[PDB]
Design a protein around this ligand. Structure first.
Ligand code: CA
Ligand code: CA
Ligand code: CA
Ligand code: CA
Ligand code: ZN
Length: 316
């Protein structure tokens, strides 16, 4: 819509108050003109037709319970845009300030969120397994990172390349959670998963086997479920990324941690310069070693730690 940029106020899924960028033109819409070609949030009104209607509100105050998932999808898309621009000098997911569109209230009792190739889509959850999924900053940033992957490396969504695509979304979802400093951890989806249960999450990067996902290449899933295990075998890469950042000893191999900012620099370079659509885990190891070599030198501690971490999870 064409109108005047302004700022409204609302409450997210977890009850927290935040300011959000809106546009006024008769109604106040969830349209943020301050970031790139804009961030746009739509109401899918419990249907599956997309994108639905651009969110309109009469008074620029978003404190109704129906408003909460829209406030968090719109705010956390802006945080994710700021992480990519400020940390990696990337404007939006295509590198040319493409508009970011999200729809909330998709379907009824839908326990997932996804990037569909054109926009982000969030279900409200069934209220038992999940609460509205845009309430998790690591979920929002995981889905927007699929758009970054699609416009760069183009990893196909099956088998080892699919597991790399999912691990890259959990890696950068976690790095955005630390950037925003929103109670950060190395778990995925803990703010919106099982509201009646404390302490759990969908997946863990620090210990994937807590929920039964593999933490070594010898334990990889080789069947056909889940597109060849794309959400299961991502645990192998997630554990290597956790070891590169934090360090530790895993299956008797010791890794010196180099921290989160270098982890993000190495994997963003690997994703944007060296990975291709059909890259497998061994090629990811080579791309991450070449990226660390480019940035820090072939005899750096950073290169050593990348090698040790892939040796610890059995990826040669
Ligand atoms: Ca209102
Ligand atoms: Ca957290
Ligand atoms: Ca998390
Ligand atoms: Ca829980
Ligand atoms: Zn994903």
């Amino acid at each position: 819509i064409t109108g005047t940029s302004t700022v409204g106020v609302g409450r997210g899924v977890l009850g927290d108050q935040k300011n959000i960028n809106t546009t006024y033109s008769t109604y106040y819409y969830l349209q943020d003109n301050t970031r790139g070609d804009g961030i746009f949030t739509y109401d899918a009104k419990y249907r599956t037709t997309l994108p639905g209607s651009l969110w309109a509100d009469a008074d620029n105050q978003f404190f109704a319970s129906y408003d909460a998932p829209a406030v968090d999808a719109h705010y956390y898309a802006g945080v994710t845009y700021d992480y990519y621009k400020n940390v990696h000098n990337r404007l939006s997911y295509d590198g040319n300030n493409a508009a970011i569109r999200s729809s909330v209230h998709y379907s009824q009792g839908y326990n997932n969120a996804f990037w569909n190739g054109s926009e982000m889509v969030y279900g409200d959850g069934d209220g038992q397994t999940f609460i509205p999924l845009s309430g998790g900053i690591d979920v929002v940033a995981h889905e927007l990172t699929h758009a970054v992957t699609d416009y760069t490396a183009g990893l196909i969504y099956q088998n080892e390349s699919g597991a790399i695509n999912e691990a890259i979304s959990d890696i950068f979802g976690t790095l955005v959670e630390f950037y925003a400093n929103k109670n950060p951890d190395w778990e995925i989806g803990e703010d919106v998963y099982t509201p009646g249960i404390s302490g759990d999450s969908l997946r863990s990067m620090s210990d994937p086997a807590k929920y039964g996902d593999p933490d070594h290449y010898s334990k990889r899933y080789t069947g056909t479920q889940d597109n060849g295990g794309v959400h299961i075998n991502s645990g192998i890469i997630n554990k290597a990324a956790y070891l590169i950042s934090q360090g530790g000893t895993h299956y008797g191999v010791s890794v010196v941690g180099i921290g989160r900012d270098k982890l993000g620099k190495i994997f963003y370079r690997a994703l944007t310069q060296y990975l291709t659509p059909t890259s497998n885990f061994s090629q990811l190891r080579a791309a991450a070693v070449q990226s660390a070599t480019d940035l820090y030198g072939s005899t750096s501690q950073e290169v050593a730690s990348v090698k040790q971490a892939f040796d610890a999870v059995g990826v040669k």
